[PDB]
Amino acid sequence: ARTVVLITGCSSGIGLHLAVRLASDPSQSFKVYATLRDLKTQGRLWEAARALACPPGSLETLQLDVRDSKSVAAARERVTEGRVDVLVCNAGLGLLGPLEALGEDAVASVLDVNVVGTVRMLQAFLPDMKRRGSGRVLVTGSVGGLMGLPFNDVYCASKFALEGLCESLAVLLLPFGVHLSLIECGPVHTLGSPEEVLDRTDIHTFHRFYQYLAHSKQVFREAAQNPEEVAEVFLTALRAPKPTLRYFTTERFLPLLRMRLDDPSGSNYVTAMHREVFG
Amino acid sequence: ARTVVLITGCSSGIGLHLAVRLASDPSQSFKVYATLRDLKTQGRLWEAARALACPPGSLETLQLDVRDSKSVAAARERVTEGRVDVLVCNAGLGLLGPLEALGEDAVASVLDVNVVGTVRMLQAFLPDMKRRGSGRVLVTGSVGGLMGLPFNDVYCASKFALEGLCESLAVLLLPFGVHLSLIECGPVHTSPEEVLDRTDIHTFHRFYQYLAHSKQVFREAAQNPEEVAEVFLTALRAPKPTLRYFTTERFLPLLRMRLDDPSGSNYVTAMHREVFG
């Protein structure tokens, strides 16, 4: 019988493309529960599943809101096979702006979804994998969790939080046979404001922001991968017999992660990334 | 022009010790606002300050609960000089255990106090430093924010979060004249029915292995809050301060081993045997 996969954040992007890539795999070894915050966004998913000709019963949708442990629980109970072989923690919010303009609730929500939500997922599904002696957990990580970037203060916070969360658990899970990996993504082919911003921020920050934005759209256009490409990395990690804690989707940033970790006082990275972003 | 300093989490430990040290400084160069979750708890602080004859008016206490933006803003406007030269984000909570055994609320508390709490402070105090073109922010970091350790999953997630938040602001903040630094601490001096039900027997084992191993590292490695406090003073008076300062070099090897292997497999192997016999 098949490898049972459950994936959070499947309405679009990586989650959507991974779920159908797995459910449509010519091996037909995967049963996929693609989970979604709101079942009303499932159109694109079911369209793509139908384009790739996913066999009947390879793909099912569940509603799963990672802010709500009872929603988490109810989705787990809906896994008829009664176990999960592969958990993919992929749901995540973005947030982009000068720290002082971001609404307090929005800061809270990014943490609650990206970090607390990933904790809830692991709390709900890890016990069974431990008791069993097997399971793959994959977490959609980020380059913004390895290095900080201006105006991504809270997004970066949350992705660094995943590093810490996962690295700690991975040290516990060795003699269990459960393999937690992070899939470190760079930019990908799939948040700001105006008078809201400037009122709260200051006249010089206001302009340093769009010098970041209009710079970012450059790096978008030279390394923003396909989610198919990314999905495919999640696959290599599943089929890995001894998977590592991190996998990288693109190499275009391993220069800086060399430079960053040369200086343990860290002010080399600060200087170099400031020049590289602005001038 | 005295240096105005505002510090969170001053009822005890690092925050208390830094507060009295700056207020007693022979120069009387510093005016200290030492803040507390609850003011009723300020007894020990003033006793410590009285011990070093901190002159009158060199130390003020305030209530500041970092979970509440109004507490943060009210505390800010009690700063009679109308500015802060040095902001110390030191308030923090701990949480230790197997992930599946920790309460959901406890998990959200740690993130809210440790991460969002620090974001609130920065939201309330940074803009003033930006328009003025000057200011220092010191944040109490941890080696647990540089490397993950078993049963410290949520604690580490929060200290890692601090690293990303601060490193991201630091890149924005060079040209404004505002220096942010993390003071990276190691350990610092100051039930199995309920465990077992919420966790397999396998993990119940490891947790107590870890607990015995932690005891030892604490006996060997722990620092006085006063030694830590002195590193904050170095950062304060560094003419161009760096993003991190370490209160110990003890764990820098383990940290480099982790920096050697970006795939992270080496770190985990090493720390697993190192921790579990």
Domains and CATH numbers, chain B: 1-277 (3.40.50.720)
Q: Could you identify the residue written with the tokens 């993130």?
A: B111
Secondary structure (3-state) at B59: strand
Nearest to B13 by CA among B29, B4, B26, B37: B37
Residue B190: Cβ-neighbour burial (10 angstroms; 0-12, 13-18, 19+): exposed
The beta-carbon neighbor of B69 closest among A104, A115, A274 is A104
Answer whether A6's CB lies under 8 Å from A78's CB: no
Q: Are residues A86 and A136 in contact, defined by beta-carbon separation less than 8 angstroms?
A: yes
**Nearest partner of A170 among B194, B208, B260, B147, judged by Cα:** B147
**Residue B237 assigned as binding residue:** no
Flag if A265 and B245 touch (Cβ within 8 Å).
yes
CA atoms within 13 A on the CB side of B105: 0
Alpha-carbon distance B39 to nearest alpha carbon in chain A (angstroms): 25
The closest alpha carbon to B159, from B231, B77, B95, belongs to B95
Active site residues of B: 155
Compare CB distances from A167 to B69, B116, B264 and report the shortest one's residue: B264
Answer whether A152 touches B (CB < 8 Å): yes
Measured distance CA(B108)–CA(B110) in Å, rounded:
6
- The position carrying tokens 């803003």 is B73
Q: What's the CA gap between B7 and B88, in Å, rounded?
A: 5
Taking a C-beta distance cutoff of 8 angstroms, is the pair B244, B250 a contact? no
Q: How far apart are CA A120 and CA A112, in angstroms?
A: 10
H helical segments located in chain B: 13-24, 43-51, 69-77, 104-111, 117-132, 153-173, 192-197, 201-221, 225-237, 252-260, 265-275
Gap from A143 CA to chain B (nearest CA, Å)? 11
Using CA atoms of A161, A163, A166, A168 in order, give the dihedral in degrees to the nearest 10: -90
Q: Which of A64, A76, A164 is nearest to A126 (CA)?
A: A76
- Rounded-to-integer distance, Cα B259 and Cα A148, Å: 16
Give the residue from A56, A88, A57 showing the smallest Cα distance to A75.
A88
Query: Is B35 assigned a ligand-binding role in the annotation?
Result: yes
CA-based nearest residue to B4, from B44, B31, B40: B31
**Scanning every residue of chain A, which has its alpha carbon at the shortest distance from the alpha carbon of B161?**
A157
Tell me how crowded residue B79 is: count the other CB atoms within 10 A of its CB: 17
* Angle made by CA atoms A149, A154, A159, in degrees to the nearest 5: 75
Q: How far is CA A228 from the centre of its chain?
A: 15
Which two three-digit tokens encode residue A149? 């970037």
Rounded to the nearest angstrom, the minimum Cα separation between B146 and chain A is 8
How far apart (Å, rounded) are the C-alpha atoms in residues B233 and B227?
Answer: 10
d(CA A4, CA A84): 5
Beta bridge pairs of residue A36:
A63
Q: What are the two backbone dihedrals, phi and then psi, of residue B62, each rounded to the nearest 5 degrees?
A: -145, 155
User: Is residue B221 marked as binding?
Assistant: no
Backbone dihedral angles phi then psi of residue B213, each to the nearest 5 degrees:
-65, -30
Cβ contact B119–A153 (<8 Å): yes
Name the token pair of B136. Answer: 């220092």
Helix-strand-coil split of chain B, %, nearest 5: 55, 15, 30
Mutation target among A160, A197, A206, A251 for the B interface, most CBs of B within 10 A: A160
> Rounded distance, CA B82 to CA B66, Å?
20
Helix axes of B225-237 and B13-24: crossing angle, nearest 10 degrees: 50
Query: Which residues 6+ apart lie within 8 Å of B118 measured at CB?
Result: B66, B89, B91, B139, B162, B165
Q: Is B167 on the interface with A (CB under 8 A)?
A: yes
Phi-psi region of A266 (alpha: psi -120 to 50; beta: other; left: phi over 0): left
Would the annotation count A36 as a binding residue?
yes
Scanning every residue of chain A, which has its alpha carbon at the shortest distance from the alpha carbon of B146? Answer: A164
Residue A168, both tokens: 């700690």
Tallying the residues shown for chain B, one arrives at 277
Three-state DSSP at A124 gives: helix
Q: Find out whether A37 is annotated in a ligand binding site.
A: yes
Tokens standing for residue B205: 């084992």
The number of beta carbons lying within 10 Å of the beta carbon of residue B167 is: 26
**Range 207-236 of B in CB contact (< 8 A) with A:** none
A264 interface with B at CB cutoff 8 Å: yes
Separation in Å, CA of B44 to nearest CA in chain A: 33
Residue A241: closest CA among A134, A161, A166, A141: A134
Angle at A150 (CA atoms; ends A149, A155), nearest 5 degrees: 65
Residues of B within 8 A of A121 (CB-CB) are none
> What are the φ/ψ torsions at residue A133 (nearest 5 degrees)?
75, 10
